Amino acid sequence: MKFTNLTAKEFGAFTDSMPYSHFTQTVGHYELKLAEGYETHLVGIKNNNNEVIAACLLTAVPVMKVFKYFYSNRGPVIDYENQELVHFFFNELSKYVKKHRCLYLHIDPYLPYQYLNHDGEITGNAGNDWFFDKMSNLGFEHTGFHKGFDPVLQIRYHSVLDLKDKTADDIIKNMDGLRKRNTKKVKKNGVKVRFLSEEELPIFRSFMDDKFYYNRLKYYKDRVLVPLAYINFDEYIKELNEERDILNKDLNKALKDIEKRPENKKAHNKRDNLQQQLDANEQKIEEGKRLQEEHGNELPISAGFFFINPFEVVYYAGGTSNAFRHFAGSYAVQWEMINYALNHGIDRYNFYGVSGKFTEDAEDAGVVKFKKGYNAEIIEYVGDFIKPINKPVYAAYTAL
Template identity: 40%
Template sequence: MNFTELTVQEYESFVQNPALESHYFQVKENIDTRESDGFDVVLLGVKDDNQQVIAASLFSKIPTMGSYVYYSNRGPVMDYDDLGLVDFYLKGLDQYLQKHNCLYVKLDPYWIYQIYDKDIKPFPDRTPNDALVTLFKSHGYTHHGFTTQYDSLSQVRWMGVLDLENQTPSSLKKKFDSQRKRNINKAIKYGIKVRFLSRDEFPIFLDLYRETEARAGFASKTDEYFYNFIDTYGDKVLVPLAYIDLDEYIEHIQGEINDKENRRDQIMQKDNKSDKQLKKIAEFDKQIAHDKKELLNASELRQTDGSILNLASGVFFANSYEVNYFSGGSSEKYNQYMGPYMMHWYMINYCLEHGYTRYNFYGLSGDFTEDSEDYGVYRFKRGFNVQIEELIGDFYKPIKKMKYRVFNTLNNIRQKIGK
């Protein structure tokens, strides 16, 4: 085996293997994203004796104090059950960085530490992957810890994932909780549609995202940040929009009213009605009254807000084996139409139709108590019967140790001044 720089073609051919479960930040398209952010990129891997790539990682070189921070966002990519290969990679990486003016290196691999069910009970056939953490530490890496909160300097360490292997829409839906089933069925009843936005239409997503940002108070991302991905990831970034066409909905509900009135009237024309028929008339009257209220509300919205209402939108990344939910937003004014539920249900079906084996709802803090900052997010994802995946976390290693101590001291001073 030998540790070496890789060509883009060698790198892409390797990370596209679904069995390796690489992250969307470790695909070829992210080279352009990082370079457009102003950073150089280097592809570092291991080849076997037949010159076949068996490990790879995309590193950004971030200029810092006259040296570089080498950061592999969700790398490296390899069979991490092969501890001998991981060990060889870390040794080769250290030797490479010693020769290439590295201040320190940061790795946050897309590698599983433990898997739990939706109620945070560990899968019985799995044990925590402590061997990997121990191996990193043996190479001089510091582990950032088994964090249970969001950190602006780190990628999420916990995820909610829907396993699609050997599943159908009906088999998945059966395992959703009652609220998820009910709200998806409501969205279907309302006739909510989903379509993908083009780049020119991306401001529709941004409007919904900014509204949600203001409502929820989460840390925002700039327009340029999103457009950078849109422009570099091509068809690997998906932006669905859930919307309602009120003209179609009004026509549909008016048809429902007409049908129920006709059926009710047919029963009313009969002489000597039975108790069952009288109950059916009362049931129709109740349904018709409800539908007329819905019709009035929809008609008023049509007059004030137009025929098309944008309900929810999201940014998703697709790679060779999973679709990953990155960010999203929805309209609070139109929340009765259940746009976010329809968006996710549509994307789950999209995954099944296109052969993806995982639908990744992505980030969770790891604090699953009721007073946690994202308990509502956890409950939403839990309702889809996700499995909870805990990643092994962040690892740091100083290469220029004296300079790194100075760097940390200056950072601590800046933080104290900032406070």
């Protein structure tokens, strides 16, 4: 067991095989930070067999002239059940950053603390409480149980949907009435989903820095997807006309029947049933033509920015057009990615950040109800810890 630097290959291979390895603990994020000019380090622990048993991507930024602010980027990735290994890692990380003029070390481990429901009630303890005391003993001072979206600190609460041993039918069955209904709706209402490339990134942007997204696409490569729910009017209108032909054919059968049995009430009811569908079909066609002329043949209605890694699919950011919410593009986008995870062996679907303030007046109250409807649960993480390396200088730094 030795603390050491890791090659990108070793780093990526290890983090891909571990639970709770954040999308920031990847080779793509490593290359991204390097590209953006950050001092970047890949550290970890190897055992006797030269096997990686812990890793962490660290970034450093100059502060107070000659020092550096070190950040663990949601890492380290390590077996947190092994308290001795955890102790060794954080002690050696401290020694490591002291070799690089660190002023203070900031860590925000992707480590569960508590589980809650979307009403803000604690449903269980993750069993990692010992972590707080150990970090304290090592000089890593916890910043507190913060809530809401901070400018610097990562959000401490995620809405997460467990997919382990579940099929798409199980997922739909566990949705609440509103989500199930809307999900069934998009499955058959003319909405389609495609994945946007860099040149169409502005379409996604229309629903929401700018370079933030571009760089993720470029460096994360296949670990990022940008689904766009949309309507292609020519294809939509074509489908409606094909459905109309069928209705017309059935209607005529109905009319013949009423002739051969002018008293058959069922036949009369059947004709009325079909005529009503024809009128609805006609209005749909007229609406399609009107929207097509005003907006063009492709109407984008919802989009999302997703990170994809072996541990989970993350719904990072997204938006939906207020004017076309009735098309349920939002549900189409979510359904596409939940299915992506189910079809390709990823057992966790992360709706990601929620404020943690489960009140009706909460800034994200509407979003939380939406996530709640998918049968997701809330995971509260331990939070942030800071270990000042040069206390007086750090004191001056904070005073600024």
